[PDB]
Design a protein around this ligand. Structure first.
Ligand SMILES: Nc1ncnc2c1ncn2[C@@H]1O[C@H](COP(=O)(O)OP(=O)(O)OP(=O)(O)O)[C@@H](O)[C@H]1O
Lengths: 249, 269
């Protein structure tokens, strides 16, 4: 029922900095053309950037650059909460450095060979965590967050200073994406999983709600059984899916 | 080495374990081998000293750290799998346990041939006969047997030939030969067999070693080979193959040989 709760679907503009529109929806929003719209999804990672390079497709499904699925999302069928937040500050500039596929070949400055021809009159309305493709060549290389002089995201400008002293890395970021075990990874304990869910849903998903009442919560759980029955896996999946901070003692 | 690990101070032992694991991780792909793991890691109810339990936990944490981020394979040696902590054999830590076991007659023959590769031995050694005779000797036991035979040959030659003639040279030492009598003496007088538990080997008794009982031979051949030689036929029908048979009758009819021959026919221990 939430108006800005709408699916996201295929995208065709290979540049991630573009975010779609839906004129019937734009009338609902105040979506203005400029730097940024805050399109909010899962895990707090967003794809914030210039807007309105769409309305080619049908409505009820926002076109968002597929590269903002691995980030900000997982798969199709998801939903975006698009709400404008244009006119960001203009700090120094946003980091410039590649991550994986640039050490393979001539490196030079890692900015003025392949990436420079893209921060042109669209000076990176971004949000740290927006990952995309940008090159001056084979057209498949990532652009990741490394540094942060301004905490909030900004719109870069020339005359600034950048240091590509940083080195491209491994997929620490790709491994980070591959984590957070879930209930789909639990089998053979469906009744036990449901019991754990009904035990830990109220204390974790509703902390203030339970703080309002004066009932005693279940604060001790004894998962006992043969070794290798997924006890730590069950605990990790429950903590990750419910959002509770998991400490592996 | 377990003694090498817990020979030093508790903190020093843990530091040595951590340094070894870090070096193995740095040298990936690397193999970590822990002989006498029961010394480091005894049964949890049996490890009396708190230092020993702390060392066990440090090893567990180090191997878990290898599991999460490393490329090192950890190997361990112990007398019995149950002598070590059951937490060691937990999934993810020690998933697969390999039973080294004892060498059979062919295995003892192979070990003797390996130890006699660089040993000038005569033609009367008949290592097949030695291996067939050798029982209760495992690996290093056969190594000590070969060493004893060589030492007896040397004490027979050097101690009796070159006394006052002239200083020893290469000609006399390379002329040394090991005979069958040296191996016999090593077998008889100067070898303690460290094996006393159950034997796990393919018995040398075959069907020809048994007389008669042709119907029993055929029935046993069915009941054993057919489940293992034709699993598809058993799976096709709705019958689970039998996993046991009982031999009953007057003593002396060869039930033991029947079991040995059916094990040999399937080449089964
Ligand atoms: N019930 C299960 N369903 C799916 N995967 C499982 C299950 N139990 C264990 N696993 C898998 O076993 C592997 C190793 O187990 P893990 O490290 O998670 O410990 P654990 O099984 O919880 O141990 P323990 O029972 O000793 O607490 C993991 O890849 C995990 O996904």
């Amino acid at each position: 029922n939430r108006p800005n709760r709408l699916i996201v679907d295929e995208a065709i503009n290979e540049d991630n900095s573009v975010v779609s529109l839906s004129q019937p929806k734009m009338d609902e929003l105040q979506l203005f053309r400029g730097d940024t719209v805050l399109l909010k999804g899962k895990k707090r990672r967003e794809a914030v950037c210039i807007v309105l390079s769409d309305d080619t497709c049908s409505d009820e499904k926002i076109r968002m650059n597929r590269v903002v699925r691995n980030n900000l999302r997982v798969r199709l069928g998801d939903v975006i909460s698009i709400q404008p937040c244009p006119d960001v500050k203009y700090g120094k500039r946003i980091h410039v450095l590649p991550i994986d596929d640039t050490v393979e070949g001539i490196t030079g400055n890692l900015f003025e060979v392949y990436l420079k021809p893209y921060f042109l009159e669209a000076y990176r309305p971004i949000r740290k965590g927006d990952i995309f493709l940008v090159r001056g060549g084979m057209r498949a290389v990532e652009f990741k967050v490394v540094e942060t002089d301004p905490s909030p995201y900004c719109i870069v400008a020339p005359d600034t200073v950048i240091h590509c002293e940083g080195e491209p890395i491994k997929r620490e970021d790709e491994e980070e994406s591959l984590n957070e075990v879930g209930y789909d990874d639990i089998g053979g304990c469906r009744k036990q999983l449901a019991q754990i869910k009904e035990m830990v849903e109220l204390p974790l998903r509703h902390p203030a709600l339970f703080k309002a009442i004066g009932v005693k919560p279940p604060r001790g759980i004894l998962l006992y059984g043969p070794p290798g029955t997924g006890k730590t896996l069950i605990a990790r999946a429950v903590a990750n899916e419910t959002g509770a901070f998991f400490f592996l003692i | 080495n377990g003694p090498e690990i817990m020979s030093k101070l508790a903190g020093e032992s843990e530091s040595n374990l951590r340094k070894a694991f870090e070096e193995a991780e740095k040298n990936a792909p690397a193999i970590i081998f822990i002989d006498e793991l029961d010394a480091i890691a005894p049964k949890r109810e049996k490890t009396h000293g708190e230092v020993e339990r702390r060392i066990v936990s440090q090893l567990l944490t180090l191997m878990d750290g290898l599991k999460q981020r490393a490329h090192v394979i950890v190997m361990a040696a112990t007398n019995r799998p149950n002598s070590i902590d059951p937490a060691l054999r937990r999934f993810g830590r020690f998933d697969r346990e390999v039973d080294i076991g004892i060498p059979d007659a062919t295995g003892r023959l192979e070990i003797l041939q390996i130890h006699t590769k660089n040993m000038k031995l005569a033609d009367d050694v008949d290592l097949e006969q030695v291996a067939n005779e050798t029982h209760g000797h495992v690996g290093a036991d056969l190594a000590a047997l070969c060493s004893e035979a060589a030492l007896q040959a040397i004490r027979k030659k050097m101690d009796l030939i070159d006394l006052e003639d002239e200083t020893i040279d290469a000609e006399v030492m390379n002329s040394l030969a090991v005979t069958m009598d040296d191996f016999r003496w090593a077998l008889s007088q100067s070898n303690p067999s460290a094996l006393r538990e159950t034997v796990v080997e393919v018995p040398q008794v075959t069907w020809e070693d048994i007389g008669g009982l042709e119907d029993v031979k055929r029935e046993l051949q069915e009941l054993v080979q057919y489940p293992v030689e034709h699993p598809d036929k058993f799976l096709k029908f709705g019958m689970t193959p039998s996993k046991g048979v009982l031999f009953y009758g007057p003593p002396g009819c060869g039930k033991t040989l029947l079991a040995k021959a059916i094990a040999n026919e399937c080449q089964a221990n």
